Design an enzyme around this catalytic site. Structure first.
Site, short mmCIF file in Angstrom:
data_model
loop_
_atom_site.label_atom_id
_atom_site.label_comp_id
_atom_site.label_asym_id
_atom_site.label_seq_id
_atom_site.Cartn_x
_atom_site.Cartn_y
_atom_site.Cartn_z
N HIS A 1 90.05 75.33 -11.86
CA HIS A 1 89.42 73.91 -12.20
C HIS A 1 90.02 73.09 -11.16
N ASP B 1 77.58 61.16 18.82
CA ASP B 1 77.77 62.49 18.20
C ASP B 1 79.39 62.25 17.98
N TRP C 1 98.26 75.05 -10.03
CA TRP C 1 97.68 74.84 -8.72
C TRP C 1 99.08 74.61 -7.68
N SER D 1 90.30 74.47 8.26
CA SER D 1 89.10 73.79 8.28
C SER D 1 89.45 72.05 8.23
N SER D 2 90.55 71.62 7.31
CA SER D 2 90.69 70.28 7.43
C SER D 2 91.68 69.92 8.69
N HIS E 1 102.36 65.13 -1.84
CA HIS E 1 101.87 63.93 -2.13
C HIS E 1 101.11 63.22 -0.82
N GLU F 1 98.70 64.97 0.68
CA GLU F 1 97.57 65.56 -0.19
C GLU F 1 96.92 64.65 -1.08
N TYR G 1 97.59 61.32 -1.20
CA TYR G 1 96.80 60.12 -0.37
C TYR G 1 95.65 60.47 0.37
N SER H 1 86.02 49.28 -0.22
CA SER H 1 85.97 48.08 0.53
C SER H 1 84.63 47.63 1.04
N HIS I 1 109.63 62.76 -6.47
CA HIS I 1 109.40 62.41 -7.54
C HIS I 1 108.31 63.51 -8.35
N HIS I 2 108.00 64.61 -7.82
CA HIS I 2 107.42 65.62 -8.50
C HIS I 2 108.57 66.48 -9.07
N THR J 1 99.66 49.04 -2.02
CA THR J 1 98.32 49.05 -2.62
C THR J 1 97.95 48.06 -3.75
N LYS K 1 96.30 45.67 -1.49
CA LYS K 1 94.79 46.21 -1.31
C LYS K 1 94.25 45.64 -2.63
N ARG L 1 102.12 70.61 -20.91
CA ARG L 1 100.85 71.12 -20.04
C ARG L 1 100.94 72.54 -20.21
C1 HEA Z 1 94.14 60.40 -6.57
C2 HEA Z 1 95.25 61.12 -6.55
C3 HEA Z 1 96.82 60.47 -7.07
C4 HEA Z 1 97.17 59.13 -6.94
C5 HEA Z 1 96.69 57.95 -5.99
C6 HEA Z 1 98.64 59.19 -7.33
C7 HEA Z 1 99.25 57.94 -7.27
C8 HEA Z 1 100.66 57.86 -7.73
N1 HEA Z 1 101.10 58.84 -8.38
FE1 HEA Z 1 100.55 60.79 -8.74
N2 HEA Z 1 100.02 62.53 -9.03
C9 HEA Z 1 98.72 63.16 -8.85
C10 HEA Z 1 97.70 62.32 -8.11
C11 HEA Z 1 97.76 61.05 -7.75
N3 HEA Z 1 98.83 60.28 -7.93
C12 HEA Z 1 98.57 64.48 -9.36
C13 HEA Z 1 97.39 65.28 -9.06
C14 HEA Z 1 99.68 64.57 -10.11
C15 HEA Z 1 100.04 66.12 -10.46
C16 HEA Z 1 101.27 66.85 -9.83
C17 HEA Z 1 101.71 67.90 -10.95
O1 HEA Z 1 101.01 68.66 -11.27
O2 HEA Z 1 103.19 67.81 -11.08
C18 HEA Z 1 100.79 63.65 -9.68
C19 HEA Z 1 101.73 63.48 -10.30
C20 HEA Z 1 102.63 62.21 -10.35
C21 HEA Z 1 104.08 62.34 -10.83
C22 HEA Z 1 104.80 63.54 -11.51
C23 HEA Z 1 105.24 63.07 -12.94
C24 HEA Z 1 105.70 64.57 -13.56
O3 HEA Z 1 104.89 65.42 -13.82
O4 HEA Z 1 106.87 64.71 -13.46
C25 HEA Z 1 104.45 61.05 -10.46
C26 HEA Z 1 105.61 60.17 -10.70
O5 HEA Z 1 106.47 59.71 -10.02
C27 HEA Z 1 103.42 60.42 -9.71
C28 HEA Z 1 103.54 59.09 -9.36
C29 HEA Z 1 102.33 58.16 -8.79
C30 HEA Z 1 102.53 56.92 -8.40
C31 HEA Z 1 103.71 56.39 -8.60
C32 HEA Z 1 101.55 56.85 -7.67
C33 HEA Z 1 100.96 55.41 -7.10
O6 HEA Z 1 100.44 55.61 -5.75
C34 HEA Z 1 99.65 54.64 -7.69
C35 HEA Z 1 99.43 53.54 -6.93
C36 HEA Z 1 99.91 52.15 -7.92
C37 HEA Z 1 99.20 50.98 -8.15
C38 HEA Z 1 97.80 51.16 -7.78
C39 HEA Z 1 99.92 50.07 -8.96
C40 HEA Z 1 98.65 48.87 -8.94
C41 HEA Z 1 99.66 47.68 -8.43
C42 HEA Z 1 99.12 46.29 -8.74
C43 HEA Z 1 97.95 46.08 -9.68
C44 HEA Z 1 100.15 45.28 -8.08
C45 HEA Z 1 101.18 44.73 -9.36
C46 HEA Z 1 102.22 45.71 -9.48
C47 HEA Z 1 103.51 45.32 -9.94
C48 HEA Z 1 103.64 43.95 -10.27
C49 HEA Z 1 104.51 46.31 -10.43
N4 HEA Z 1 102.33 61.11 -9.71
C1 HEA Z 2 89.57 66.22 -8.22
C2 HEA Z 2 90.28 66.39 -9.14
C3 HEA Z 2 90.03 66.60 -10.54
C4 HEA Z 2 89.03 66.13 -11.44
C5 HEA Z 2 87.68 65.45 -11.01
C6 HEA Z 2 89.16 66.38 -12.82
C7 HEA Z 2 88.18 66.42 -13.71
C8 HEA Z 2 88.41 66.76 -15.12
N1 HEA Z 2 89.73 67.34 -15.56
FE1 HEA Z 2 91.17 67.96 -14.48
N2 HEA Z 2 92.87 68.34 -13.23
C9 HEA Z 2 93.14 68.28 -12.05
C10 HEA Z 2 92.18 67.74 -11.17
C11 HEA Z 2 90.82 67.19 -11.44
N3 HEA Z 2 90.39 67.21 -12.64
C12 HEA Z 2 94.27 68.96 -11.55
C13 HEA Z 2 94.87 68.89 -10.08
C14 HEA Z 2 95.03 69.60 -12.89
C15 HEA Z 2 96.01 70.01 -12.89
C16 HEA Z 2 95.83 71.75 -13.19
C17 HEA Z 2 97.38 72.20 -13.50
O1 HEA Z 2 97.82 72.13 -14.67
O2 HEA Z 2 97.59 73.14 -12.54
C18 HEA Z 2 93.76 69.27 -13.93
C19 HEA Z 2 93.91 69.55 -15.19
C20 HEA Z 2 93.16 69.21 -16.09
C21 HEA Z 2 93.65 69.73 -17.50
C22 HEA Z 2 94.65 70.58 -18.12
C23 HEA Z 2 94.61 71.64 -18.72
C24 HEA Z 2 95.97 72.30 -19.19
O3 HEA Z 2 96.85 71.94 -18.30
O4 HEA Z 2 95.95 72.61 -20.41
C25 HEA Z 2 92.30 69.11 -18.38
C26 HEA Z 2 92.32 69.36 -19.71
O5 HEA Z 2 91.92 68.38 -20.20
C27 HEA Z 2 91.51 68.51 -17.40
C28 HEA Z 2 90.32 67.94 -17.52
C29 HEA Z 2 89.45 67.43 -16.99
C30 HEA Z 2 88.18 67.04 -17.38
C31 HEA Z 2 87.81 67.05 -18.85
C32 HEA Z 2 87.38 66.19 -15.95
C33 HEA Z 2 86.23 65.53 -16.04
O6 HEA Z 2 86.30 64.32 -15.26
C34 HEA Z 2 85.14 66.52 -15.39
C35 HEA Z 2 84.19 65.52 -14.88
C36 HEA Z 2 84.06 65.36 -13.32
C37 HEA Z 2 82.81 65.74 -12.69
C38 HEA Z 2 81.65 65.48 -13.43
C39 HEA Z 2 82.97 65.87 -11.07
C40 HEA Z 2 82.30 64.47 -10.52
C41 HEA Z 2 81.02 64.85 -9.74
C42 HEA Z 2 80.02 64.50 -9.81
C43 HEA Z 2 79.60 63.44 -10.98
C44 HEA Z 2 78.88 64.91 -8.86
C45 HEA Z 2 79.01 64.87 -7.57
C46 HEA Z 2 77.95 65.19 -6.40
C47 HEA Z 2 77.37 64.23 -5.91
C48 HEA Z 2 77.76 62.95 -5.66
C49 HEA Z 2 76.24 64.99 -4.94
N4 HEA Z 2 91.92 68.57 -16.13
CU CU Z 3 103.31 62.07 -5.81
#
Ligand code: HEA
Ligand code: HEA
Ligand code: CU
Ligand code: TGL
Ligand code: PC1
Ligand code: 3PE
Ligand code: 3PE
Ligand code: 3PE
Ligand code: 3PE
Ligand code: 3PE
Ligand code: 3PE
Ligand code: CUA
Ligand code: NA
Ligand code: ZN
Lengths: 43, 514, 144, 104, 227, 46, 72, 47, 49
Positions: free
Chosen positions: B61, B91, B126, B156-157, B240, B242, B244, B255, B290-291, B316, B319, B438
């Site tokens: 998943h 192109d 993952w 690819s990327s 991380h 990845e 962003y 935007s 932070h991870h 952000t 933004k 988890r």
């Molecule tokens: C879309 C993907 C995405 C994005 C944008 C982010 C964004 C951020 N992530 Fe996350 N993160 C993940 C995907 C993402 N992360 C995933 C997939 C994991 C799991 C990894 C794993 O399995 O271990 C993870 C895990 C993860 C952890 C691990 C926790 C743990 O397991 O120990 C932490 C902790 O530091 C973290 C932090 C953050 C922070 C601080 C941001 C920030 O960039 C968020 C941006 C902040 C804002 C948008 C704040 C809004 C601000 C305002 C409105 C202004 C006003 C604010 C103040 C006045 C304070 N992320």
């Molecule tokens: C892109 C990243 C992504 C997205 C969308 C989701 C979506 C969802 N995830 Fe996922 N999830 C992860 C990334 C994501 N997850 C990661 C990275 C982990 C950590 C794995 C780990 O522990 O190692 C995780 C883990 C994770 C767990 C942890 C299981 C466990 O550790 O025990 C669970 C269960 O609750 C869960 C649930 C869901 C559910 C219910 C949705 C729902 O939102 C599903 C609905 C989503 C969609 C429907 C897709 C949207 C697409 C469309 C609508 C069509 C697009 C097509 C066109 C536009 C043409 N996710």
């Molecule tokens: Cu991070």
């Protein structure tokens, strides 16, 4: 984004048929494989 | 006539079309895996039995939704369709590597599907941390096939990133500056920069893991002098950036959507948008540990990493306040993509503040590997990135297909999706706070009720994507084309027609500096 | 009729309140009576009746601002469709609970949960605020 | 700038002796983008400009965008009409409320 | 431990879980403030009917919109660093426990003097005594003295584990070829339930941790009886 | 030269409504039904 | 009588100023509502529990029903 | 200049401006920029 | 002109509201989902050995 009138407009019955087709085509294989998990576990 | 048009394609629109098709298929694979995960967690007990098959489903998943749904559709599809259209290029600069990147993606998908099929299965998450992903706990060919899937996706990327950076920097009109380009072009530039600065780190990491598995090197097991914290360092130094990569072209898409459907001729604070995107890209490389707040680092190291996480939190915020400021006092047209963009703004704000809660290392010691993290990353990924994807798809489906969607079904789809995913991922905050960790297939009874609620929310979201398919079919069940499009003077991609011809910008744009 | 592929190049009459005076007239070609009104337009407007005014305004423009800002009724249909399909999700969950899911573990019946929450307040599980602090330890009942 | 040069520049721009339809459309399309309800002598100049180039219906949408540029509170538009009455019966231009274009 | 319909954290026993719980309340108040700001502003600023779609002063509010989130971010960050530096001070402990997480069972060594070691496996669901807790009860509970600093060294033999107990505020990675510090104290006697947080195979859900905290004389009697 | 216009820039014919409905549902249903058959395979093995 | 001259410019700006005042008051109000509803009652609940807490009688009334593996 | 009957014309019509505005330019006499009105004419004879 | 929405929105609200609340009440109550409710004030504690 303004649009043309539909060249081949769709009746409501055909939209109902289409959504029923999508639902049955998605829930027949997944529904079938979740209809019996215990049979796959060597009953 | 078919294999020359599509299999041997050398123009960006066709590559973006096949990117959209492949990503839609892979997203449907991913939501099937998510339905499986919430199916086992719906009631207490073992629906599937052991935790190994559940971990295989969880890893599949994660990898399918990360590397095969958001990245191809978003980056490849929207970049190939729009980046030569907004900058006025005929192109891509290197169209053959664009075609090769797309055609490298389904080999990687087939290798991942084969990795789930060998008798062990890559049930490690993952994060592919050793020694669980070694040849002792996972003696087999599943982890190697997953490693090669990531290798092919990385190549690819990297190829796509090289092509995007050279086509953005070089193929402008000679009078335009880089600061006169649209914001999605900027997001694609910065995303491609971080992609080719980040991907070789994981390439080297999984190369070293593969040689640990099959060449008897001791990079990671401590019996030969290795250290798995080195793997975690390399993996998150990629990981991380990845993150962003996942979020930044969504920022460009929202935007563009808010600027269009708000009636504004420019987003407010374009320089602030550009500076904040550059700052997010530059600061994504210094916040990886932070991870790793519970692995046993230095106290000063984690103090620096939580501080650097606050400095990545500020721009952000710039933004999102600039999005609010460009919402101010416009002719707000309540289109479906408008609803997707406002849902993006609110729910990505909630995911960001949950990330800020996770930013503190002490509350990260409490909340590491719990479902609070899962709620955070789903509120950003599965809600912000998916809502930005759906906003871009709903907005540019007249440009791609030539037909307009039914807006009433689209607003119903947004409402169903909103309710479903909100009731899916809000009890996970309480499950994380209470302390159920988890990667579990079975939980104690005290975590039952929220899990039950969470499971049924997934089904509502499932119904959403079901009627999403109906949406697409209804467009081709209607065949209504376009009169014309409003605000086509500012948006360049709309001014060649819907859909644009195969040959666009044969006579290029005419812009002067003096 | 059907026009050539360059329907994108030329400007089109678009109706929005952000653009009150559009660049293209709503009706391009005109009949002979409409040319009689257009010839009458070069004289004074004092001898213009109601109907010439209304139909020439409908020549130059299509919808007034009162017509385009009217409250249509699509949000009721949208949320009603949402509640249809959410009810269908309830049907899918009913089918899964009946057929997909097996029995619950035996730690959920009344006697096991009775002895379990007797033991849970016996060892004083989180007795500051959460669970064992909602129980009275003198009257052997819950707090009222 | 301040109010008097804005107002004077717009009333002198809308009283161009050789004005055509395109720049009149520019003026009345860019004027309604400001955080502003247009001053009544700008509207007087625009109505006489529509009369000068012999076009009726754009003057009626000029009155309509005066009415809906006000927003919620309706103490703007009756006041603007109560000042614009002598222009409105020296040119023969009709209000939107009497033509039936306001009754939805 | 967790109770049904629980929303917040488990209640605290160690001092550090009290200070982290108060800091969680502080930062969640900040989260509620910012989320309500964003929600109320967007709901305000969509529902207008006035419009302004022309040229606007580009830089006249940016300095305020950059200084205020910095103020709130340092307001979060200073108590975060203050409690961050209050986990690795001078401890001068009392006991030293060594915990090794083997392939799906924990093992405990008390070898300060008179070397003692045992294994913790889960009581299976069909083998539960009545009244017990599903997926949390163990064979041998891990017995520790009351309200004293206890040094604790965590590692694993083969793969990555995570020795975690939430109500004492402990969660520490168990890495092979490593040895991790955690000091553990208490304020109330009783039983505390945690479980492994790192992914460790096909029975990852199936290693629990039970800490039984008793007075020191009863800990001495248990140490004499267990050896 | 390749076809230009609405519905012709796509790799499949949209000219029949019901054929395209069947093609869409088998395409996306195969996408949805792949991991369930994968899980069936892993349960049948051990 | 006839109508006076009302305010013609700065309408959305004055709406923004009065409702940014309202936004700050309502955001501080809901934050203080959460604070005075949850955080301060939790702090005084912990103070009430630990101000007159005896551990010996607490352990003795846990061990009178046989929970510990060490105290029989 | 052009080789066809129309050409995309992009205008930076005041300096230090972000967004270009684009419009088609046809044959005949000169059209103009929709916001600034600088006159643009097309002479399609080059190669 | 009387469009689709003008009366069918009221019809679809009535249908959607009563359909959703009826079948969600049924799936929450009648199909025997064990919700594991809070034991505060509901179950009396039973003496374990
Ligand atoms: C879309 C993907 C995405 C994005 C944008 C982010 C964004 C951020 N992530 Fe996350 N993160 C993940 C995907 C993402 N992360 C995933 C997939 C994991 C799991 C990894 C794993 O399995 O271990 C993870 C895990 C993860 C952890 C691990 C926790 C743990 O397991 O120990 C932490 C902790 O530091 C973290 C932090 C953050 C922070 C601080 C941001 C920030 O960039 C968020 C941006 C902040 C804002 C948008 C704040 C809004 C601000 C305002 C409105 C202004 C006003 C604010 C103040 C006045 C304070 N992320
Ligand atoms: C892109 C990243 C992504 C997205 C969308 C989701 C979506 C969802 N995830 Fe996922 N999830 C992860 C990334 C994501 N997850 C990661 C990275 C982990 C950590 C794995 C780990 O522990 O190692 C995780 C883990 C994770 C767990 C942890 C299981 C466990 O550790 O025990 C669970 C269960 O609750 C869960 C649930 C869901 C559910 C219910 C949705 C729902 O939102 C599903 C609905 C989503 C969609 C429907 C897709 C949207 C697409 C469309 C609508 C069509 C697009 C097509 C066109 C536009 C043409 N996710
Ligand atoms: Cu991070
Ligand atoms: C002679 C017969 C008639 C002419 C051929 C048409 C049918 C066969 C075909 O080659 O059909 C054409 C193919 C096109 O597919 C390809 O060309 C390659 C796809 C690669 C997918 C890889 C999946 C993973 C494989 C490995 C595992 O279509 C498919 O197979 C299925 C597509 C179904 C519709 C999808 C709609 C998607 C909507 C969302 C995106 C909109 C984008 C708008 C823009
Ligand atoms: C006690 C009372 C409260 C005290 C509050 C203030 C504490 C501030 C401590 C900040 C961290 C200082 C430190 O030693 O950092 C070590 C870190 C060490 O990081 P590093 O480079 O060694 O990281 C590699 C980590 N290992 C070795 C595990 C692979 O120093 C720095 O990163 C740079 C110097 C300090 C920067 C501090 C500000 C951070 C925000 C701006 C970043 C730009
Ligand atoms: C049952 C699912 C299929 C319902 C089909 C149906 O009722 O279609 C009628 C209508 C089609 O759309 P219609 O309102 O006619 O026009 C578009 C409005 N701009 O459908 C809709 O507008 C959507 C409402 C469907 C309600 C069910
Ligand atoms: C591994 C894959 C390597 C692919 C590769 O080396 O491609 C070389 C590429 C081909 O030439 P290309 O520029 O794409 O042709 C189109 C217009 N000249 O050449 C280029 O695009 C120029 C050099 C790029 C090198 C990239 C290597 C990876
Ligand atoms: C919980 C899930 C909630 C989902 C809500 C989805 C609502 C969909 C209906 C909708 O938004 O309809 C658009 C409608 C405005 O329609 P329109 O005719 O353009 O209004 C101008 C005034 N005559 O109405 C509106 O836009 C009114 C505001 C309702 C939608 C707010 C969405 C915020 C995101
Ligand atoms: C959107 C809001 C931002 C996301 C918040 C996520 C964190 C969360 O919901 O935490 C639960 C929070 C604190 O829980 P607490 O009230 O202390 O529970 C014990 C006593 N009831 O609980 C609450 O604040 C009350 C319940 C949730 C309200 C929303
Ligand atoms: C690749 C996909 C994998 C599966 C293969 C599917 C092959 C085709 C079978 C499905 C399409 C089909 O034949 O559907 C049956 C349908 C019957 O016609 P019907 O829908 O009743 O007519 C419209 C009036 N309601 O038939 C039709 O609708 C087709 C006839 C419509 C008119 C065609 C005109 C052609 C002119 C040249
Ligand atoms: C007094 C100084 C102080 O620190 O007051 C606390 C708070 C304002 O200060 P501060 O904590 O910075 O603001 C909340 C930050 N999230 O101030 C408050 O929380 C205000 C508490 C009293 C007023 C409550 C009004 C409620 C209205 C509904
Ligand atoms: Cu040990 Cu999970
Ligand atoms: Na389960
Ligand atoms: Zn210009």
């Amino acid at each position: 984004v303004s649009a043309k009138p539909a060249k081949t407009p769709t009746s409501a019955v055909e939209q109902a048929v289409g959504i029923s087709a999508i639902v049955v085509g998605f829930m027949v294989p997944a529904g079938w494989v979740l209809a019996h998990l215990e049979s796959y576990k060597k009953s | 006539m078919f294999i020359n048009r599509w299999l041997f394609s050398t123009n960006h629109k066709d590559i973006g079309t096949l990117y959209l098709l492949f990503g839609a298929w892979a997203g449907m694979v991913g939501t099937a895996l998510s339905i499986l995960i919430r199916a086992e967690l719906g009631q207490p007990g073992a629906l599937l039995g052991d935790d190994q098959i559940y971990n295989v489903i969880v890893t599949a998943h994660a990898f399918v939704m990360i590397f095969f749904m958001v990245m191809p559709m978003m980056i490849g599809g929207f970049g190939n369709w729009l980046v030569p259209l907004m900058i006025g290029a005929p192109d891509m600069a290197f169209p053959r590597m664009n075609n090769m990147s797309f055609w490298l993606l389904p080999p990687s998908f087939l290798l991942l599907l084969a990795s789930s099929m060998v008798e062990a299965g890559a049930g490690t998450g993952w994060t592919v941390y050793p020694p669980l992903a070694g040849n002792l706990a996972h003696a087999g060919a599943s982890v190697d096939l997953t490693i090669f899937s990531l290798h092919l996706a990385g190549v690819s990327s990297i190829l796509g990133a090289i092509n995007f950076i050279t086509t953005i920097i070089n193929m402008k009109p000679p009078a335009m500056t880089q600061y006169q380009t649209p914001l999605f072009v900027w997001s694609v530039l910065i995303t491609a920069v971080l992609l080719l600065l980040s991907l070789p780190v994981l390439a080297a990491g999984i190369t070293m893991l593969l040689t640990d598995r099959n060449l008897n090197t001791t990079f990671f097991d401590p019996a030969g002098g290795g250290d798995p914290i080195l793997y975690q360092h390399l993996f998150w130094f990629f990981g991380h950036p990845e993150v962003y990569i996942l979020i930044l072209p969504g920022f460009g898409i929202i935007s563009h959507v808010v600027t269009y459907y708000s009636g504004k001729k420019e987003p407010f604070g374009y320089m602030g948008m550009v500076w904040a995107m550059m700052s997010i890209g530059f600061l994504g490389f210094i916040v990886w540990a932070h991870h790793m707040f519970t692995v046993g680092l230095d106290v000063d190291t984690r103090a620096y990493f939580t501080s650097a996480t606050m400095i990545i939190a500020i721009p952000t915020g710039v933004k999102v306040f600039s999005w609010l400021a460009t919402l101010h006092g416009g002719n707000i047209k309540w289109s479906p993509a408008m609803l997707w963009a406002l849902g993006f703004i609110f729910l990505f704000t909630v995911g960001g503040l949950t990330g800020i809660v996770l930013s503190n290392s002490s509350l990260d010691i409490v909340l590491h590997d719990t479902y609070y993290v899962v709620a955070h990353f789903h509120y950003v990924l599965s809600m912000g990135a998916v809502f930005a994807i759906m906003a871009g798809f709903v907005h540019w489906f007249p440009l791609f297909s030539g037909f307009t969607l039914d807006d009433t079904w689209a607003k119903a789809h947004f409402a169903i999706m909103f309710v479903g995913v909100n009731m899916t991922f809000f009890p996970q905050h309480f499950l994380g706070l209470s302390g159920m960790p988890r990667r579990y297939s079975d939980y104690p009874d005290a975590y039952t009720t929220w899990n039950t609620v969470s499971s049924m929310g997934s089904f509502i979201s499932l119904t959403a994507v079901l009627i999403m398919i109906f949406m697409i079919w209804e467009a081709f069940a209607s065949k209504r084309e376009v009169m014309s499009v409003s605000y086509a003077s500012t948006n360049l991609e709309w001014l060649h027609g819907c859909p644009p011809p195969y040959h666009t910008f044969e006579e290029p744009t005419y812009v002067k500096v003096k | 009729s059907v026009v050539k592929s360059e329907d994108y190049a030329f400007p089109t009459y678009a109706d929005r309140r952000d653009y009150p005076l559009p660049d293209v007239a709503h009706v391009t070609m005109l009949s002979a009576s409409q040319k009689a009104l257009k010839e009458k337009e070069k004289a004074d407007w004092s001898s213009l009746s109601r109907d010439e005014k209304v139909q020439l305004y409908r020549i130059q423009f299509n919808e007034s601002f009162a017509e385009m800002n009217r409250g249509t009724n699509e949000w009721k249909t949208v949320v009603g469709m949402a509640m249809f399909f959410i009810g269908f999700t309830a049907l899918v969950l009913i089918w899964e609970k009946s057929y997909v899911y097996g029995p619950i573990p035996h730690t959920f019946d009344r006697d096991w949960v009775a002895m379990q929450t007797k033991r849970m307040l016996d060892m004083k599980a989180n007795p500051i605020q959460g669970f064992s602090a909602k129980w009275d330890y003198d009257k052997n009942e819950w707090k009222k | 700038e301040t109010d008097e040069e804005f107002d004077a520049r717009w009333v002198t721009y809308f009283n161009k002796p050789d004005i055509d339809a395109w720049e009149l459309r520019k003026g009345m399309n860019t004027l309604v983008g400001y955080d502003l309800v247009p001053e009544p002598k700008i509207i007087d100049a625009a109505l006489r400009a529509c009369r000068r180039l012999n076009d009726f219906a754009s003057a009626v949408r000029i009155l309509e965008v005066v009415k809906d540029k006000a927003g919620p509170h309706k103490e703007i538009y009756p006041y603007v009409i109560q000042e614009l009455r002598p222009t409105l019966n020296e040119l023969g231009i009709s209000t939107p409320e009497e033509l039936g274009l306001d009754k939805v | 431990m967790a109770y049904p319909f629980q929303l917040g954290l488990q209640d605290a026993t160690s001092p550090i879980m009290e200070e982290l719980m108060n800091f969680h309340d502080h930062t969640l108040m900040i989260v509620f403030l910012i989320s309500s700001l964003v929600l109320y502003i967007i709901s305000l600023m969509l529902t207008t009917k006035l419009t302004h779609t022309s040229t606007m002063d580009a830089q006249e509010v940016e300095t305020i919109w950059t200084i205020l989130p910095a103020v709130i971010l340092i307001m979060i960050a200073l108590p975060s660093l203050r409690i961050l530096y209050m986990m690795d001070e001078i401890n001068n402990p009392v006991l030293t426990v060594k915990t090794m997480g083997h392939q799906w069972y924990w093992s405990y060594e008390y070898t300060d003097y008179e070397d003692l070691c045992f294994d913790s496996y889960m009581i299976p669901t069909n083998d539960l005594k009545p009244g017990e807790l599903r997926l949390l009860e163990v064979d041998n509970r891990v017995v520790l003295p009351m309200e004293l600093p206890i040094r604790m060294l965590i590692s694993s033999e083969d793969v990555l584990h995570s020795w975690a107990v939430p109500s004492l505020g402990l969660k520490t990675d168990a890495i092979p070829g490593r040895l991790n510090q955690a000091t553990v104290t208490s304020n109330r006697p009783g039983l505390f339930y945690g479980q492994c947080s790192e992914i460790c195979g096909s029975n990852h859900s199936f290693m629990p941790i039970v800490l039984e905290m008793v007075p020191l004389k009863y800990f001495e009697n248990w140490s004499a009886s267990m050896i | 030269h390749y076809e230009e216009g609405p519905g012709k820039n796509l790799p499949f014919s949209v000219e029949n409504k019901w054929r395209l409905l069947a093609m869409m549902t088998v395409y996306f249903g195969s996408g949805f039904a792949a991991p369930f058959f994968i899980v069936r395979h892993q349960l049948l093995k051990k | 009588a006839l109508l006076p001259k009302p305010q013609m410019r700065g309408l959305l700006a004055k709406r923004l100023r009065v409702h940014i005042a309202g936004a700050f008051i309502v955001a501080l109000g809901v934050a203080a509502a959460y604070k005075f509803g949850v955080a301060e009652p939790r702090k005084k609940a912990y103070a009430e529990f630990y101000r007159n807490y005896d551990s010996m009688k607490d352990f003795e009334e846990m061990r009178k029903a046989g929970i510990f593996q060490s105290a029989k | 200049p052009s080789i066809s009957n129309k050409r995309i014309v992009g205008c930076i019509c005041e300096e230090d401006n972000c967004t270009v505005i684009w419009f088609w330019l046809h044959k005949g006499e000169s059209q103009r920029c929709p916001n600034c009105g600088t006159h643009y004419k097309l002479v399609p004879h080059q190669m | 002109a009387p469009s689709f929405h003008d009366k069918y929105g009221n019809a679809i609200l009535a249908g959607g509201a009563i359909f959703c609340v009826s079948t969600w009440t049924y799936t929450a109550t009648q199909i025997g989902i064990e919700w594991n409710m809070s034991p505060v004030g509901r179950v009396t504690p039973k003496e374990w050995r």
